Amino acid sequence: PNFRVGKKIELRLGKNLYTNEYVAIKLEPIKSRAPQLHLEYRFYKQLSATEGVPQVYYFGPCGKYNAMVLELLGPSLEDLFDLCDRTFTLKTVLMIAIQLITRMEYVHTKSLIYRDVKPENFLVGRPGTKRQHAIHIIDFGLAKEYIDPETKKHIPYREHKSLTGTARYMSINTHLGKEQSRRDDLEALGHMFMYFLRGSLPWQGLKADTLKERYQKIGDTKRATPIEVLCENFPEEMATYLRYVRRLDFFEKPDYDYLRKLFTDLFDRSGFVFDYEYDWAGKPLPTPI
Ligand SMILES: Nc1ncnc2c1c(I)cn2[C@@H]1O[C@H](CO)[C@@H](O)[C@H]1O
């Protein structure tokens, strides 16, 4: 349709001219060597049929750029994490986790692996909207098809991959240079869940002579940190989740129902109600508007 573009939030704020609804506009130089935005558009369209991703409204030229126009959502879990003094309660982590296992299952069901799990990439809905309490997944810049579309077969196992990604959440097998698969998306979520609960991960803050060596140093520490220690003083289901996903084979389909039951059983046993009343409920949320 017809859109106008505003200030930076390259991501910009924009407006649908006929509805006067705000939107987000991602921009890539039209003269780019290595254009990637069209590829990310492709992924969002593959995933269109769920309400856990932003809607995309347009891909094409806005001037000296190509533009992808998408639904404007709320703050990221990292934004909200900061708001809540960098810890989340169990109830809030569980509501997040149950949603994101389902979200990740849906991405996997559409033949894609995500490969960029981090709290910055999960957003609540826009304050005041119907889906304001839902958690959404964004940014498929690192995503990849794990099922070849002609052969209908899973991508081959491969080693010595070079590391791109947020070192903090990545799976141990990713650290090792292995081709990422479904398992790795779920392990990374697990690391993020512990991050939320603990306030931090014990391999945060590590520094090295290079970024390559920082990845290695962080991987060493993940390998040297037993799940029993990492999840010490937190429910066993957290460790149960982590052990399960750490043991998954490269080609293995995860039992998403099982992992979800771990958490939904604990949620109920804990006496929690799925009210979408998060730690950040009632707090004034940031907006570009
Ligand atoms: N569609 C959207 N609606 C609202 N905000 C958005 C998006 C998208 I795509 C990204 N963001 C914000 O930009 C930060 C960097 O990805 C993210 O951490 C996030 O806060």
- Domain shared by 179 and 79, yes or no: yes
- Domain shared by 64 and 79, yes or no: no
Count of domains for the chain? 2
Report the structure determination method. X-ray
Which residues are CB-contacts of 182 (< 8 A; sequence separation ≥ 6)?
Answer: 108, 113, 146, 248, 252, 253, 254
In three-state secondary structure terms, 91 is helix
- Pocket of ligand 1, candidates 123, 132, 136, 140: which has the most ligand atoms within 8 Å of its Cβ, to mutate? 123
Resolution given for this structure, in angstroms: 2.4
In three-state secondary structure terms, 150 is coil
Residue 258, domain CATH: 1.10.510.10
- Domain shared by 3 and 91, yes or no: no
How far apart are alpha carbons 113 and 160 in whole angstroms?
Answer: 18
Q: How far is the CA of 161 from the centre of ligand 1 (A)?
A: 28
How far apart are alpha carbons 119 and 142 in whole angstroms?
Answer: 15
Last residue of a domain, one of 27, 55, 73: 73
Look at strands 65-71 and 56-62 and give their pairing.
antiparallel
- Domain shared by 49 and 128, yes or no: no
Last residue of a domain, one of 40, 73, 106: 73
Shortest-distance Cα residue to atom 17 of ligand 1: 120
- Domain shared by 26 and 47, yes or no: yes
- Domain shared by 182 and 157, yes or no: yes
- Domain shared by 53 and 85, yes or no: no
Helix (H) or strand (E) holding 185: helix 182-198
Q: Is the distance from CB of 87 to CB of 196 less than 8 angstroms?
A: yes
Active-site residues, by number, are 116
CA nearest to 283, candidates 23, 121, 100, 74:
74
How far apart are alpha carbons 119 and 109 in whole angstroms?
Answer: 22
Binding site residues for ATP, as ranges? 9-11, 26
Residue type for position 157: Y
- Domain shared by 3 and 99, yes or no: no
Task: Name the residue range of residue 113's domain.
Answer: 74-289
Q: How far is the CA of 24 from the centre of ligand 1 (A)?
A: 8
- Domain shared by 188 and 231, yes or no: yes
Structure-block tokens of residue 253: 């389909």
- Pocket of ligand 1, candidates 11, 27, 82, 118: which has the most ligand atoms within 8 Å of its Cβ, to mutate? 11
Shortest-distance Cα residue to atom 14 of ligand 1: 120
Q: How far is the CA of 221 from the centre of ligand 1 (A)?
A: 31
Last residue of a domain, one of 25, 41, 73: 73
- Domain shared by 7 and 128, yes or no: no
Q: Which of the 8 DSSP states describes residue 121?
A: G
CA nearest to 179, candidates 145, 217, 213, 227:
145
